[PDB]
Design a protein around this ligand. Structure first.
Ligand SMILES: Nc1nc2c(ncn2[C@@H]2O[C@H](COP(=O)(O)OP(=O)(O)NP(=O)(O)O)[C@@H](O)[C@H]2O)c(=O)[nH]1
Ligand SMILES: [Cl-]
Ligand SMILES: [Mg+2]
Ligand SMILES: [Mg+2]
Length: 298
């Protein structure tokens, strides 16, 4: 813990000339990124070399586009420091203060408080999805086409060594992908990782901030409801997403649910593909095991 911090302190002070680190601690870890709280005031997100190049470039472009075009009281990161290179990227911004939404917290809220939070979310998503995205048009994401490409990569690498059960899970997913219509609707700018661990509450349990637009892009409108609709320990629950969808309006709820159910089915495959691309056997294994867990359930 002590050593990472020292290296990152050095790099921050090196790349940002007059920035002085008086304190620094790890506040979070993705699987190939790390976030630090610095001087109790700044978040610094960092990343070394990864399969997905230009990641922090797009993320930065999005923050800039949003800070310029959103009219909202909800805070999002506003980038003050950035360094972007193949081998190393860093984004720094002032920490948004607040408490992350969790299921526990939600359950202590009154019905009215829950309603106002749902309205706040719906409104934010309505405003973001409504933006003219011409100026960020480079940030397009085609999930269907991405999946097809990932399937081809599988075929070119490990597919032949998979078991029949594994192959059947994959082929049955591809058949569903080919039959669905859920990619043919409205495209817009989406947060695209819109889970409750990215949502911040103020002291009245109202939505005060949103973080981690690191996967954001122009993509299906349905994308931003995938976690709101999720039934799991980490998310609030399907009814929460449903109510938010009704407040948001003008969207086919059944298709939103189909979209979520398809993304969830893909997860073990997505995991395997991550392992292949990053030469991390442990992910390949975990994804394959998960296919068995899902196959044997019910
Ligand atoms: N309170 C607060 N916490 C933050 C803020 N920015 C980041 N964090 C904390 O740091 C964690 C990492 O932030 P995030 O942008 O989610 O990074 P990521 O998921 O790890 N990595 P990537 O986005 O590269 O996949 C968050 O889960 C959260 O705990 C902020 O502005 N305010
Ligand atoms: Cl394996
Ligand atoms: Mg995150
Ligand atoms: Mg992220």
């Amino acid at each position: 813990n002590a050593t990472n911090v020292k290296a990152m302190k050095y790099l921050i002070e090196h790349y940002f000339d007059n920035f002085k680190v008086d304190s620094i601690e790890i506040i979070g870890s993705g699987y190939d990124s790390v976030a630090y709280l610095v001087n109790n005031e700044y978040i610094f997100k960092t990343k070394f070399s990864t399969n997905k190049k230009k990641g922090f470039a797009k993320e930065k472009a999005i923050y800039n586009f949003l800070n310029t075009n959103l009219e909202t009281n909800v805070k999002i990161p506003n980038i003050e420091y950035s360094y972007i290179s193949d081998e190393l990227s860093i984004l720094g911004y002032k920490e948004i203060k607040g408490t992350f939404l969790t299921p526990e917290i939600y359950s202590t809220m009154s019905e009215e408080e829950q309603n106002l939070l749902k309205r706040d979310i719906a409104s934010f998503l309505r405003q973001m999805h409504g933006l003219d995205y011409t100026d960020i048009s480079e940030c397009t994401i085609d999930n269907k086409q991405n999946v097809l490409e990932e399937y081809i990569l599988l075929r070119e690498t490990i597919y032949n060594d998979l078991t029949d059960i594994e192959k059947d899970y994959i082929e049955s997913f591809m058949e569903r992908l080919n039959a669905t219509t859920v990619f043919e609707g409205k495209k817009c700018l989406c947060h695209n990782d819109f889970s409750c661990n990215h949502l911040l509450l103020d002291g009245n349990n109202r939505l005060t901030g949103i973080i981690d637009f690191g996967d954001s892009g122009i993509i299906d409108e349905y994308c931003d409801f995938i976690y709101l609709l999720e039934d799991s320990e980490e998310e609030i629950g399907t009814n929460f997403g449903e109510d938010i969808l009704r407040m948001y309006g003008n969207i086919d709820i059944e298709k939103a649910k189909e979209y979520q159910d398809i993304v969830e089915e893909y997860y073990p495959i997505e995991t395997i593909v991550y392992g292949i691309k990053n030469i991390k056997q442990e992910f390949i294994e975990n994804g394959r095991k998960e296919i068995y867990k899902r196959t044997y359930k019910d």
